[PDB]
Amino acid sequence: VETFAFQAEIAQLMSLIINTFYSNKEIFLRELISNSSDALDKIRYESLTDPSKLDSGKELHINLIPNKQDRTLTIVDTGIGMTKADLINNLGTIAKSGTKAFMEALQAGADISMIGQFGVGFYSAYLVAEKVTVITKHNDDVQYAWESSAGGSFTVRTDTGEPMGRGTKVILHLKEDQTEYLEERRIKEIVKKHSQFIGYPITLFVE
């Protein structure tokens, strides 16, 4: 288990997201789906000239899995996935150019929905989740598990769970008062409202 500190302003942004009430929390789902769509675009374009890229699975899709028993909302895609370096670099350690400006915008009264435009939309997951687990599988690399309950740090380890083929799975352990995101019609309506033009199938697993 390797522990990493978040870059100074990303940690500050996570603290702001967790400790300030924002009304429009539902946008976390749009942000997560948009990352899945970009990872799906990446593998799709690479596969055009190299069919071996899809040896790990040909279907390009997004699955949404609410689980009321464990209080988790899981977002699974079959995108390009992340290597160990992609995970540590892109999920917290390296500075994002828009972090400082986004924190100043929020302080000046900007809506939380603006997050994606500043390139830090992943962190909107902390609007609804007390803990976030990201399992990822990239071609020619092993399966990794990234995890953080915020507080300034995250962990990376080799994943020993169920193999995923290729892609990324985001497991959101929802805050006690954020259980509306486990309801089938509430998930369906946030998808129609914010992610209707995403070019990939988005399937909801009704429990």
Ligand SMILES: CC1(C)CNc2cc(O)c(C(=O)N3Cc4ccccc4C3)cc21
């Ligand atoms: C964790 C989070 C940022 C939120 N949710 C996801 C979902 C993901 O599939 C991925 C992912 O695997 N990648 C790799 C890649 C390559 C090019 C462009 C974008 C991305 C994001 C990442 C994320």
